[PDB]
Amino acid sequence: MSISPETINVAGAQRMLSQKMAREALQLRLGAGDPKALAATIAQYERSAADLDAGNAERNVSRMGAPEIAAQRQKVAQIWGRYRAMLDQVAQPASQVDLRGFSQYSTELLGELNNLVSLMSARADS
Amino acid sequence: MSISPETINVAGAQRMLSQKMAREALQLRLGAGDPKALAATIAQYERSAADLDAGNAERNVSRMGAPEIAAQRQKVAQIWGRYRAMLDQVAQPASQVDLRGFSQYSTELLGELNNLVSLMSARAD
Ligand code: NA
Ligand code: NA
Ligand code: NA
């Protein structure tokens, strides 16, 4: 591997975080949740996204400048912005939302994050 | 690396699957879910757990026999068995369930899956 294992770990964990935040938001919709937990999960995702975009030497996350990888990070980022806004709405018990649309979007983001991991691994691995 | 990168990918994805299942079960609790999706996610976790325990040549998942890794897979399996049962309760809109208990247990399983990934990576480089 040309990148650190931690780089691939952080990218893979984005997949998990996307799902964790959805569960936390749905639990908030049910009135049994914790806004602090949701915020913290979203913050972990965003911290990792910035680390993957810029590199983070302290955290041992490599910036991968390959154009296809950078393009996939940007594709992910556009989906993420819309998903993040949906999370905020889902988490409010009294809001109007489309829960099937939310689920579809969670699955879409997950797929694009998995695609990011795949591209990173292809470039990194022998 | 002594193990295939796919081995680490599959172990990491178990973290994700544990959380996807919770998302799906809560969607079902809210009447906006899909039982087939939850079933598929559970099945994927179970196949991957089997692959990590035994190896799977077709899928390029390597065996890792180090005692600490085997012990952690066993620890995960005990938590998983209990978690899996909780899912069915959560997913029923009309059940009485303790959702905070469920989320705590989801986070516990996630942590042990993360610990498994860490142990695997340490051994693999
Ligand atoms: Na919550
Ligand atoms: Na083994
Ligand atoms: Na097992």
GROMACS .gro file of N, CA and C in nm, chain A residues 47-105:
model
  177
   47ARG      N    1  -1.522   1.573   0.999
   47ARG     CA    2  -1.380   1.581   1.030
   47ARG      C    3  -1.304   1.490   0.934
   48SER      N    4  -1.355   1.368   0.917
   48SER     CA    5  -1.292   1.275   0.826
   48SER      C    6  -1.297   1.323   0.683
   49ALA      N    7  -1.408   1.384   0.641
   49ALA     CA    8  -1.419   1.434   0.504
   49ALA      C    9  -1.311   1.539   0.477
   50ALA      N   10  -1.291   1.629   0.574
   50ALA     CA   11  -1.190   1.733   0.558
   50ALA      C   12  -1.050   1.672   0.559
   51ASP      N   13  -1.026   1.572   0.644
   51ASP     CA   14  -0.898   1.504   0.646
   51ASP      C   15  -0.867   1.436   0.514
   52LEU      N   16  -0.967   1.372   0.453
   52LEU     CA   17  -0.947   1.305   0.324
   52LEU      C   18  -0.923   1.407   0.213
   53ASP      N   19  -0.983   1.525   0.224
   53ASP     CA   20  -0.966   1.628   0.122
   53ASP      C   21  -0.829   1.696   0.130
   54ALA      N   22  -0.781   1.719   0.252
   54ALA     CA   23  -0.660   1.799   0.275
   54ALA      C   24  -0.538   1.723   0.323
   55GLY      N   25  -0.560   1.600   0.368
   55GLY     CA   26  -0.460   1.527   0.443
   55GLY      C   27  -0.457   1.573   0.586
   56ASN      N   28  -0.413   1.483   0.674
   56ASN     CA   29  -0.397   1.516   0.813
   56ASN      C   30  -0.281   1.436   0.865
   57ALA      N   31  -0.167   1.502   0.879
   57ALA     CA   32  -0.044   1.431   0.915
   57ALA      C   33  -0.052   1.370   1.054
   58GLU      N   34  -0.108   1.446   1.148
   58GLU     CA   35  -0.121   1.401   1.287
   58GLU      C   36  -0.204   1.274   1.295
   59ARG      N   37  -0.310   1.268   1.215
   59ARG     CA   38  -0.400   1.154   1.214
   59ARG      C   39  -0.355   1.041   1.120
   60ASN      N   40  -0.250   1.067   1.043
   60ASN     CA   41  -0.197   0.970   0.947
   60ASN      C   42  -0.297   0.940   0.837
   61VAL      N   43  -0.364   1.044   0.790
   61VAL     CA   44  -0.452   1.035   0.675
   61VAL      C   45  -0.386   1.105   0.559
   62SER      N   46  -0.361   1.031   0.453
   62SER     CA   47  -0.299   1.082   0.330
   62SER      C   48  -0.400   1.156   0.241
   63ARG      N   49  -0.360   1.267   0.178
   63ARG     CA   50  -0.443   1.327   0.074
   63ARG      C   51  -0.413   1.247  -0.051
   64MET      N   52  -0.516   1.203  -0.123
   64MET     CA   53  -0.499   1.132  -0.246
   64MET      C   54  -0.547   1.223  -0.357
   65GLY      N   55  -0.452   1.273  -0.435
   65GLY     CA   56  -0.478   1.377  -0.534
   65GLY      C   57  -0.521   1.328  -0.672
   66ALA      N   58  -0.526   1.196  -0.692
   66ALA     CA   59  -0.566   1.140  -0.819
   66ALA      C   60  -0.697   1.202  -0.863
   67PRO      N   61  -0.707   1.243  -0.991
   67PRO     CA   62  -0.829   1.315  -1.030
   67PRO      C   63  -0.959   1.239  -1.009
   68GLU      N   64  -0.960   1.108  -1.035
   68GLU     CA   65  -1.082   1.030  -1.017
   68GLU      C   66  -1.123   1.020  -0.871
   69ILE      N   67  -1.024   1.021  -0.780
   69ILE     CA   68  -1.054   1.012  -0.637
   69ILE      C   69  -1.105   1.148  -0.590
   70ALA      N   70  -1.039   1.256  -0.628
   70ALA     CA   71  -1.086   1.391  -0.597
   70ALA      C   72  -1.227   1.413  -0.652
   71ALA      N   73  -1.255   1.368  -0.773
   71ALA     CA   74  -1.388   1.384  -0.833
   71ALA      C   75  -1.493   1.307  -0.753
   72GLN      N   76  -1.460   1.186  -0.708
   72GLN     CA   77  -1.553   1.110  -0.626
   72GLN      C   78  -1.576   1.176  -0.490
   73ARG      N   79  -1.473   1.235  -0.430
   73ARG     CA   80  -1.493   1.310  -0.304
   73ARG      C   81  -1.589   1.425  -0.329
   74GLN      N   82  -1.578   1.493  -0.443
   74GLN     CA   83  -1.670   1.603  -0.471
   74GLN      C   84  -1.812   1.556  -0.496
   75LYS      N   85  -1.829   1.443  -0.564
   75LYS     CA   86  -1.961   1.385  -0.586
   75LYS      C   87  -2.025   1.349  -0.453
   76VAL      N   88  -1.947   1.286  -0.367
   76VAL     CA   89  -1.992   1.252  -0.231
   76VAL      C   90  -2.033   1.378  -0.155
   77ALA      N   91  -1.952   1.482  -0.165
   77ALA     CA   92  -1.979   1.606  -0.092
   77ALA      C   93  -2.112   1.669  -0.131
   78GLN      N   94  -2.147   1.664  -0.258
   78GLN     CA   95  -2.275   1.723  -0.300
   78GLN      C   96  -2.392   1.644  -0.244
   79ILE      N   97  -2.382   1.511  -0.245
   79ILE     CA   98  -2.488   1.426  -0.189
   79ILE      C   99  -2.495   1.448  -0.038
   80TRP      N  100  -2.379   1.453   0.027
   80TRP     CA  101  -2.372   1.476   0.170
   80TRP      C  102  -2.444   1.603   0.212
   81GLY      N  103  -2.424   1.714   0.141
   81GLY     CA  104  -2.493   1.837   0.179
   81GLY      C  105  -2.643   1.821   0.185
   82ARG      N  106  -2.699   1.753   0.088
   82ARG     CA  107  -2.843   1.730   0.085
   82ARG      C  108  -2.887   1.633   0.193
   83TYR      N  109  -2.809   1.529   0.215
   83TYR     CA  110  -2.841   1.430   0.319
   83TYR      C  111  -2.837   1.493   0.457
   84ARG      N  112  -2.736   1.576   0.481
   84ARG     CA  113  -2.723   1.641   0.612
   84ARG      C  114  -2.846   1.726   0.642
   85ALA      N  115  -2.896   1.798   0.541
   85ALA     CA  116  -3.016   1.879   0.563
   85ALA      C  117  -3.136   1.789   0.593
   86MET      N  118  -3.144   1.673   0.528
   86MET     CA  119  -3.254   1.580   0.554
   86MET      C  120  -3.247   1.527   0.697
   87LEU      N  121  -3.127   1.495   0.745
   87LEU     CA  122  -3.110   1.447   0.883
   87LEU      C  123  -3.168   1.543   0.984
   88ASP      N  124  -3.139   1.671   0.966
   88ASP     CA  125  -3.187   1.773   1.055
   88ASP      C  126  -3.340   1.777   1.059
   89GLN      N  127  -3.404   1.757   0.944
   89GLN     CA  128  -3.550   1.754   0.936
   89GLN      C  129  -3.607   1.625   0.997
   90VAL      N  130  -3.549   1.511   0.964
   90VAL     CA  131  -3.595   1.384   1.018
   90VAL      C  132  -3.594   1.384   1.167
   91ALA      N  133  -3.489   1.441   1.226
   91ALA     CA  134  -3.470   1.439   1.370
   91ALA      C  135  -3.572   1.523   1.450
   92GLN      N  136  -3.648   1.608   1.382
   92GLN     CA  137  -3.749   1.692   1.445
   92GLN      C  138  -3.884   1.618   1.442
   93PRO      N  139  -3.936   1.576   1.559
   93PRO     CA  140  -4.057   1.494   1.557
   93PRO      C  141  -4.175   1.552   1.484
   94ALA      N  142  -4.189   1.684   1.487
   94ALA     CA  143  -4.307   1.752   1.432
   94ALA      C  144  -4.288   1.802   1.292
   95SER      N  145  -4.177   1.767   1.226
   95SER     CA  146  -4.156   1.813   1.088
   95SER      C  147  -4.230   1.732   0.984
   96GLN      N  148  -4.236   1.787   0.864
   96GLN     CA  149  -4.286   1.716   0.747
   96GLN      C  150  -4.168   1.664   0.669
   97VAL      N  151  -4.162   1.533   0.646
   97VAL     CA  152  -4.052   1.472   0.570
   97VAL      C  153  -4.104   1.357   0.489
   98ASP      N  154  -4.023   1.314   0.393
   98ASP     CA  155  -4.052   1.193   0.314
   98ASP      C  156  -3.955   1.085   0.361
   99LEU      N  157  -4.001   0.995   0.448
   99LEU     CA  158  -3.909   0.899   0.508
   99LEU      C  159  -3.856   0.797   0.406
  100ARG      N  160  -3.935   0.763   0.305
  100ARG     CA  161  -3.885   0.675   0.200
  100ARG      C  162  -3.778   0.744   0.117
  101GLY      N  163  -3.797   0.873   0.090
  101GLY     CA  164  -3.696   0.950   0.020
  101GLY      C  165  -3.567   0.959   0.101
  102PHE      N  166  -3.581   0.975   0.232
  102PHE     CA  167  -3.466   0.979   0.322
  102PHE      C  168  -3.386   0.848   0.317
  103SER      N  169  -3.457   0.738   0.325
  103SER     CA  170  -3.393   0.608   0.316
  103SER      C  171  -3.320   0.587   0.184
  104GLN      N  172  -3.386   0.625   0.075
  104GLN     CA  173  -3.322   0.614  -0.056
  104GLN      C  174  -3.193   0.696  -0.060
  105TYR      N  175  -3.198   0.814  -0.002
  105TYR     CA  176  -3.083   0.900  -0.004
  105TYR      C  177  -2.969   0.848   0.085
   0.00000   0.00000   0.00000
